Enzyme design. Structure first.
Site, PDB file in Angstrom:
ATOM      1  N   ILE A   1       0.843  -1.183   0.000  1.00 21.97           N
ATOM      2  CA  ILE A   1       0.000   0.000   0.000  1.00 21.97           C
ATOM      3  C   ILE A   1       0.881   1.235   0.000  1.00 21.97           C
ATOM      4  CG2 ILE A   1      -1.503   1.429   1.426  1.00 21.97           C
ATOM      5  CD1 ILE A   1      -2.889  -1.117   2.320  1.00 21.97           C
TER       6      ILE A   1
ATOM      7  N   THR B   1       4.687   5.380   8.829  1.00 23.42           N
ATOM      8  CA  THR B   1       5.599   5.962   9.794  1.00 23.42           C
ATOM      9  C   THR B   1       6.565   4.899  10.303  1.00 23.42           C
ATOM     10  OG1 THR B   1       3.884   7.501  10.607  1.00 23.42           O
ATOM     11  CG2 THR B   1       5.819   7.150  11.993  1.00 23.42           C
ATOM     12  N   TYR B   2       6.033   3.727  10.643  1.00 21.51           N
ATOM     13  CA  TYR B   2       6.848   2.659  11.219  1.00 21.51           C
ATOM     14  C   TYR B   2       7.336   1.550  10.300  1.00 21.51           C
ATOM     15  CZ  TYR B   2       4.888   5.108  15.151  1.00 21.51           C
ATOM     16  OH  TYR B   2       4.513   6.160  15.958  1.00 21.51           O
TER      17      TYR B   2
ATOM     18  N   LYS C   1       0.673  -3.922   8.757  1.00 20.44           N
ATOM     19  CA  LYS C   1       1.774  -2.999   8.942  1.00 20.44           C
ATOM     20  C   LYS C   1       2.949  -3.644   9.660  1.00 20.44           C
ATOM     21  CE  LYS C   1      -1.619   0.751   9.168  1.00 20.44           C
ATOM     22  NZ  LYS C   1      -1.794   2.205   9.523  1.00 20.44           N
TER      23      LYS C   1
ATOM     24  N   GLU D   1      -8.197  -3.262  10.183  1.00 22.23           N
ATOM     25  CA  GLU D   1      -9.315  -3.457   9.254  1.00 22.23           C
ATOM     26  C   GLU D   1      -8.928  -2.636   8.037  1.00 22.23           C
ATOM     27  OE1 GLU D   1     -12.999  -1.082   9.451  1.00 22.23           O
ATOM     28  OE2 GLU D   1     -12.276  -0.338  11.372  1.00 22.23           O
TER      29      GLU D   1
ATOM     30  N   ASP E   1       0.036  12.326  15.489  1.00 24.80           N
ATOM     31  CA  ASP E   1       0.533  12.506  14.130  1.00 24.80           C
ATOM     32  C   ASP E   1      -0.591  12.383  13.121  1.00 24.80           C
ATOM     33  OD1 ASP E   1       2.404  12.920  12.054  1.00 24.80           O
ATOM     34  OD2 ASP E   1       2.736  10.767  11.820  1.00 24.80           O
TER      35      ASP E   1
ATOM     36  N   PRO F   1      -3.823  13.781   6.658  1.00 28.39           N
ATOM     37  CA  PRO F   1      -4.748  13.227   5.658  1.00 28.39           C
ATOM     38  C   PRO F   1      -4.493  11.768   5.266  1.00 28.39           C
ATOM     39  CG  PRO F   1      -4.322  15.534   5.189  1.00 28.39           C
ATOM     40  CD  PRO F   1      -3.337  15.118   6.257  1.00 28.39           C
TER      41      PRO F   1
ATOM     42  N   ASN G   1      -3.501   9.309   7.153  1.00 30.15           N
ATOM     43  CA  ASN G   1      -4.024   8.292   8.073  1.00 30.15           C
ATOM     44  C   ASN G   1      -5.488   8.450   8.480  1.00 30.15           C
ATOM     45  OD1 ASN G   1      -3.820  10.212  10.291  1.00 30.15           O
ATOM     46  ND2 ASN G   1      -1.712   9.485  10.665  1.00 30.15           N
TER      47      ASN G   1
END
Ligand SMILES: C=CCNc1nc(N)c(C(=O)c2ccc3ccccc3c2)s1
EC number: 2.7.11.22
Length: 294
Positions: free
Chosen positions: A10, A14-15, A33, A77, A123, A126, A128
């Site tokens: 995707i 950040t991580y 993620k 989800e 943080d 737009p 997230n």
């Protein structure tokens, strides 16, 4: 992954990398993620684990925390589109006001919920904020900032956006409060209305000065204690505040009034998500369905 058959990358969060994956045990499509590193802190595992219990219609559900092979994966989800892509897609026409208002109302409900449970996002941006075909919008990644740390880029060199960062954070305050999320949402609200980022800084100081040039350089009158903040410098130029009428036209007065309260310098004077939900701007709020191209 074996328990998951990657559909596509995707992008990069950040991580770490985020994939659209299918759970072979359920056939359910999710957002997986990967959390980028010397053993994975247990304090993190425990904290994150508590987030699985956070459920609200405007919060992206954290389905699972997977710590295996000494790697950490977060299963979320999956949602249809992100606000950034939707705004870009609505650039010619702009998002209708009723939808902007619905989205803002729902985001505040999300924040009000997380904040009442003492969970901060820190943080918001737009990228997230996720939307679906039914007109709902949800916040992704609440609570990760505290559980994990604060990276410079992401994990492999990637310019982290500072556009939505609250002034107290830019001035070096080490203790964040729920107000940092209200500031970010205010910046996002303005951006949906004007179709242009409100404070598009390209460095911490540029970010700070763009804020000062619009809202005026803060002082002890409007922000008690500001001159004692860690990175405050008496040498900061002194800019006069500009009229909100010029900042978010053609937003009506109720909208401008609410935005001004979300963008107050003093974190303690900034409106809470709960109080904002009672603002007269939402008196005629409805839940329109957006035109999503998937
Ligand atoms: C936008 C379509 C993909 N669907 C998604 N569903 C969820 N739940 C996502 C996320 O939770 C998310 C949030 C922020 C990101 C930022 C960069 C790259 C990927 C990211 C992914 S992204």
């Amino acid at each position: 992954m074996e328990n998951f058959q990657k559909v596509e990358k995707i992008g990069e969060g950040t991580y770490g990398v985020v994939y659209k994956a299918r759970n072979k045990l359920t056939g359910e499509v999710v957002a997986l993620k990967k959390i980028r590193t010397e053993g994975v802190p247990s304090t993190a595992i425990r904290e994150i684990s508590l987030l699985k219990e956070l459920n609200h219609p405007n919060i992206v559900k954290l389905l699972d925390v997977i710590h295996t092979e000494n790697k950490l994966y977060l299963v979320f989800e999956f949602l249809h589109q992100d606000l950034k892509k939707f705004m870009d897609a609505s650039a010619l026409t702009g998002i209708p006001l009723p939808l902007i208002k619905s989205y803002l109302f729902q985001l505040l409900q999300g924040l009000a919920f997380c904040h009442s449970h003492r969970v901060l996002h820190r943080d918001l941006k737009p990228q997230n904020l996720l939307i679906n075909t039914e007109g709902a919008i949800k916040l992704a990644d609440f609570g990760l900032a505290r559980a994990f740390g604060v990276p410079v880029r992401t994990y492999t060199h990637e310019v982290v956006t500072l556009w939505y960062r609250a002034p107290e954070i830019l001035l070096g305050c080490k203790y964040y409060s729920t107000a940092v999320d209200i500031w970010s949402l205010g910046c996002i609200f303005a951006e949906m209305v004007t179709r242009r980022a409100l404070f598009p800084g390209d460095s911490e100081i540029d970010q700070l000065f763009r804020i000062f040039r619009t809202l005026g350089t803060p002082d002890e009158v409007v922000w008690p204690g500001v001159t004692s903040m860690p990175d405050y410098k008496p040498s900061f130029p002194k800019w006069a505040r500009q009229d909100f009428s010029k900042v978010v036209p053609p937003l009506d007065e109720d909208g401008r009034s609410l935005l001004s309260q979300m963008l107050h310098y003093d974190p303690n004077k900034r409106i809470s998500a709960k109080a904002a939900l009672a603002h007269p701007f939402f008196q005629d709020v409805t839940k329109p369905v957006p035109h999503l191209r998937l």
